[PDB]
Automatic annotation (TrEMBL):
Stored Gene3D superfamilies: Conserved hypothetical protein from pyrococcus furiosus pfu- 392566-001, domain 2 (3.30.1760.10), Conserved hypothetical protein from pyrococcus furiosus pfu- 392566-001, ParB domain (3.90.1530.10)
InterPro entries linked to this entry: ParB/Sulfiredoxin_sf, ParB_N, SerK/SbnI_C, SerK_C
Modified residues (N6,N6-dimethyllysine): K17, K97, K102, K123, K126, K149, K162, K191, K211
UniProt keyword Metal-binding, yes or no: no
Domain ParB-like N-terminal: from-to ranges: 9-104
Taxonomic classification: Archaea, Methanobacteriati, Methanobacteriota, Thermococci, Thermococcales
Name of the protein: ParB-like N-terminal domain-containing protein
Species assigned in the record: Pyrococcus furiosus (strain ATCC 43587 / DSM 3638 / JCM 8422 / Vc1)
Listed GO MF terms: ATP binding; kinase activity
Entry keyword set: ATP-binding, Kinase, Nucleotide-binding, Transferase
UniProt xrefs under Pfam families: ParB_N, SerK_C
Keyword Oxidoreductase: no
Lineage: superkingdom: Archaea
């Protein structure tokens, strides 16, 4: 898709509402980058929540949260019509380099079930279980939203402890191709939400587990060049 210079507008951070949780490494990396470079270059993508003067964060949770942590006030933003057909939503695929037996033990310690099930991926994609865990073997992790959050918490902890390397793939096919090559061991598969589900969630004040949405527009917003000091 084409890159397009789009006009941004500064929006106050306190008007932005998240729809998903954070990955600690991504939060800390953003803070390190923006303070080290002094430049904010990737605009927030926002959509107004109907009946309010608040915005759904479409893209930029880690940027918003990092700026809030730094004590900033505003961020450059592109305002979208969320239900325009050009706005599409997919998901991310958490994958790891590491020992699946250690991951499974940690998942079970958090009260999750991990069940060998050759239909796990199909069930996950239908929204019937929290995640499928797919590699040499195929496991179902039953549940829904709360169980997805428990899985993600374990992964973030193991990422921080360097027990695994935790990476997020945009495309399931890419994760599977890298597993074939021996670059990753297992991938977690869940169903993407619909846009209607995202907006319903933010309207009730709730959030998904980290990296639940991956939004795509008909164009790529060109990068911008805003000084960090201008956000305060
Ligand atoms: Na997202």
């Amino acid at each position: 898709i084409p890159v397009k210079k789009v006009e941004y507008v500064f929006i106050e951070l306190d008007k932005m509402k998240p729809h998903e949780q954070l990955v600690q490494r991504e939060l800390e990396d953003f803070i390190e980058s923006v303070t080290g470079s002094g430049i904010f270059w990737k605009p927030m993508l926002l959509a107004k929540i109907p009946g309010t003067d608040e915005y759904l964060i479409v893209d930029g949770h880690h940027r918003w949260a990092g700026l809030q942590k730094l004590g900033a006030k505003r961020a450059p933003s592109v305002i979208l019509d969320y239900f325009d057909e050009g706005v599409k939503v997919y998901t991310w695929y958490p994958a790891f380099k590491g020992d699946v037996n250690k991951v499974i033990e940690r998942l079970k310690a958090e009260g999750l079930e991990v069940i060998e099930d050759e239909k796990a991926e199909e069930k996950a994609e239908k929204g019937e279980i929290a995640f499928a865990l797919i590699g040499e073997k195929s496991f179902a992790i039953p549940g829904g939203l709360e169980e997805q959050k428990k899985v993600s918490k374990v992964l973030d902890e193991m990422d921080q402890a360097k027990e695994i390397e935790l990476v997020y793939y945009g495309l399931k096919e890419d994760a599977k191709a890298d597993m074939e090559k021996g670059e990753i061991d297992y991938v977690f598969i869940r169903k993407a939400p619909t846009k209607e589900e995202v907006m319903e969630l933010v309207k009730r004040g709730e959030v998904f587990s980290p990296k639940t949405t991956r939004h795509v527009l008909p164009f790529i917003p060109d990068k911008i060049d805003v000084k960090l000091e201008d956000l305060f």
